[PDB]
Amino acid sequence: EVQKPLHEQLWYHGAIPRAEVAELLVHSGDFLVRESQGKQEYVLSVLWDGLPRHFIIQSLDNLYRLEGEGFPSIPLLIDHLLSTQQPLTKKSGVVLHRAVPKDKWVLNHEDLVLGEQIGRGNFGEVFSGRLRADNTLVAVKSCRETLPPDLKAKFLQEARILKQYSHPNIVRLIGVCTQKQPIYIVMELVQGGDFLTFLRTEGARLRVKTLLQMVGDAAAGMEYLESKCCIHRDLAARNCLVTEKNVLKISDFGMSREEADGVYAASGGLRQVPVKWTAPEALNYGRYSSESDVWSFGILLWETFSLGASPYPNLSNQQTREFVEKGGRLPCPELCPDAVFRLMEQCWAYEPGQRPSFSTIYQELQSIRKRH
Numbered sequence: 008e009v010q011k012p013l014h015e016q017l018w019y020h021g022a023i024p025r026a027e028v029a030e031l032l033v034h035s036g037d038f039l040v041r042e043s044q045g046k047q048e049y050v051l052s053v054l055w056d057g058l059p060r061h062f063i064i065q066s067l068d069n070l071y072r073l074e075g076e077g078f079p080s081i082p083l084l085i086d087h088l089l090s091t092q093q094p095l096t097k098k099s100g101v102v103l104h105r106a107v108p109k110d111k112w113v114l115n116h117e118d119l120v121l122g123e124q125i126g127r128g129n130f131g132e133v134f135s136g137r138l139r140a141d142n143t144l145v146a147v148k149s150c151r152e153t154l155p156p157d158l159k160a161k162f163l164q165e166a167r168i169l170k171q172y173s174h175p176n177i178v179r180l181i182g183v184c185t186q187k188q189p190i191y192i193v194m195e196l197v198q199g200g201d202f203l204t205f206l207r208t209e210g211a212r213l214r215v216k217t218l219l220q221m222v223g224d225a226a227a228g229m230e231y232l233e234s235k236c237c238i239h240r241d242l243a244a245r246n247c248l249v250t251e252k253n254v255l256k257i258s259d260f261g262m263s264r265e266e267a268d269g270v271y272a273a274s275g276g277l278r279q280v281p282v283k284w285t286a287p288e289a290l291n292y293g294r295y296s297s298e299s300d301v302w303s304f305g306i307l308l309w310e311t312f313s314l315g316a317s318p319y320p321n322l323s324n325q326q327t328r329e330f331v332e333k334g335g336r337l338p339c340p341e342l343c344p345d346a347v348f349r350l351m352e353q354c355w356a357y358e359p360g361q362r363p364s365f366s367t368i369y370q371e372l373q374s375i376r377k378r379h
């Protein structure tokens with residue numbers, strides 16, 4: 008192990024950002040080695056007095072050192088520090104205790120080939136791609152380096168969340184390329200693309216039964232998310248994906264948040280908030296919950312049965328908020344069955360406690376589908 012190159016070491020995390028570092032270092036003396044993207048030097052990061060401390064690993068005459076002996080590799084330096092229990096510096100008194108290994112989700116850049124751009128997200132372009140080992144087709148999310156540091160820190164949230172999930176109606180994470188820049192999130196490629204484009208393109212040919220089965224899929228995904236305490240926050244047709252067999256998967260988990268007691272209090276400072284898909288209490292008071300996702304699901308039902316019409320077309324975001332406060336809601340689409348529209352109206356109850364559960368939504372859509 009100690010003879011293996013640095014890049015192969017389990018405790019070498021490469022281009023991991025500072026915020027993820029604090030996530031991974033749990034106990035006193037927990038440590039990892041990474042590359043400082045800014046400075047272009049190796050860094051030893053160690054938890055001490057509850058906070059991560061960062062030490063620049065010095066290099067001279069092909070020997071690596073801190074303030075003591077030099078070694079011809081960083082793994083030899085780390086082995087020395089761990090085995091001797093010598094403080095990293097006399098001044099700091101920091102002592103290594105446990106190497107934090109990479110999780111199973113870390114993917115080497117060499118394992119991936121990027122293809123054509125397929126979309127544009129809030130953080131940057133999304134590309135198609137392939138895993139070199141087996142020709143698995145993938146979708147690859149990128150993060151533009153010019154984004155504000157506070158927003159870039161949030162990029163890996165989608166991956167942290169999806170690491171935990173497995174469901175037929177939720178997009179599958181494949182890995183995260185954090186060993187070098189540029190940082191990527193790698194997911195299964197859902198080849199039929201987004202649901203909004205699907206509806207608009209294939210509209211005329213779609214049977215009501217098929218539409219009900221697809222939103223039924225969306226409801227199952229959301230039921231699963233609710234069971235995991237996940238609040239999605241960005242549910243919309245454009246953020247659902249369609250497989251070759253017309254199965255719908257929920258996608259785009261960048262804004263999603265896990266909350267054990269079911270409520271996420273927003274910072275208030277979110278840019279490009281999907282106002283027309285968002286519940287009043289979430290906009291007014293920053294109160295996001297499964298109940299605010301239910302509101303969004305109502306809008307998704309509307310998009311589905313209008314075959315991809317744009318909601319509140321004649322209104323600005325602010326006018327839409329004012330309209331909704333007055334009791335304004337979207338009209339019944341002509342292809343929408345009466346029963347679907349009654350469910351839709353319940354999803355848009357002004358008070359969050361009055362909206363249906365995702366279980367109820369799933370079961371109601373299923374019952375309607377068995378008529379058609």
Ligand SMILES: Cc1cccc(Nc2nc(N[C@@H]3CCCC[C@@H]3N)c(C#N)cc2C(N)=O)c1
Pocket residue numbers: 125126127128133146148178194195196197198199200201245246247248258259260
């Ligand atoms: C053919 C085709 C066309 C378009 C997308 C995809 N696939 C994806 N698109 C995505 N984000 C997109 C951002 C822009 C609007 C559409 C998507 N929401 C995301 C995410 N996260 C994942 C995929 C995926 N895993 O296949 C595939």
